[model samples]
Target: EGVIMSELKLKPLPKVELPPDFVDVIRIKLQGKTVRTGDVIGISILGKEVKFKVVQAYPSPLRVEDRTKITLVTHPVDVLEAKIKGIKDVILDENLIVVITEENEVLIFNQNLEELYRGKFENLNKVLVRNDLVVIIDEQKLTLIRT
Candidate 1:
């Protein structure tokens, strides 16, 4: 009475297709990094094709978490592009930021806040911001982004 079991391989998830609301399929390369549901990547329009490049990557700002933070600790930033009726409060932590204005309708940006980028990344505990590293309009320009 000896019946050797061949095997019972499992852990197989059924193949799936894009969600109903998910229209348009744009591809990107994230420098060998796994793409998550929420991340931001900048794009540079090229010619009339409305094209861009970056084998390494860029996530759609409209659908990512980039609008949540506003890092003033960054270098005399390229003049914030946001339009706040009045000043409120701002704070920065290790690669984190928060803001609240008199006209603020949402904390994470509800007024269709355009994606704002190009800031020198910073860490916490430093009254002074570090200008050693930054992200820019050009990806070829290596970065000093702090975690």
Candidate 2:
């Protein structure tokens, strides 16, 4: 006897525009000097041009220059123009794992910024890291992966 399976098709949802200033840049400072690392001083900004006061300081990881380039690992190994924006969460391991809010896409890249893997989901917001594993949280789903 032969059995047939039915197919289910789902349509993509419409995209929504986010507020222009939805993100606030919280400037992190260390010690009494405007330097990175060591003296653990930080500031959090909420909305508009408002700035908060510094409470205490703590030790932090070493700082690296933004101009520094690193390798990236990604799937579709030949794709060279994958643009990532609105990175809501980032996990730095042997590879850089990123959660982009704009398109709800999870992207993994090597130090040199090469695409290693890409996954799409609904309303991806945060990332939880455990050792070499990465866990992503969307609206109602969780994805776990290991680098």
> Which candidate gets the maximum lDDT versus the true structure?
2
Of candidate 1, the 10-residue stretch with the lowest lDDT total is 5-14
Error of 2 at 55 (Å): 47
State residue 129's C-alpha deviation in candidate 1, in Å: 18
Lowest-lDDT window of 10 residues in candidate 2? Answer: 6-15
TM-score of each: 0.19, 0.35
Model 1's number of clashes is 2
Tens-digit lDDT track of model 1 for 81-141: 7565665566443443444444432132212344333233222122232333233222233
Residue-by-residue lDDT tens digits, candidate 2, 15-98: 223244322112112212333222332333334232222222222222223322212112223554556556565566654545
Report the error of model 1 at residue 118, Å. 22
* Model 1 steric clash pairs: 29-56, 133-144
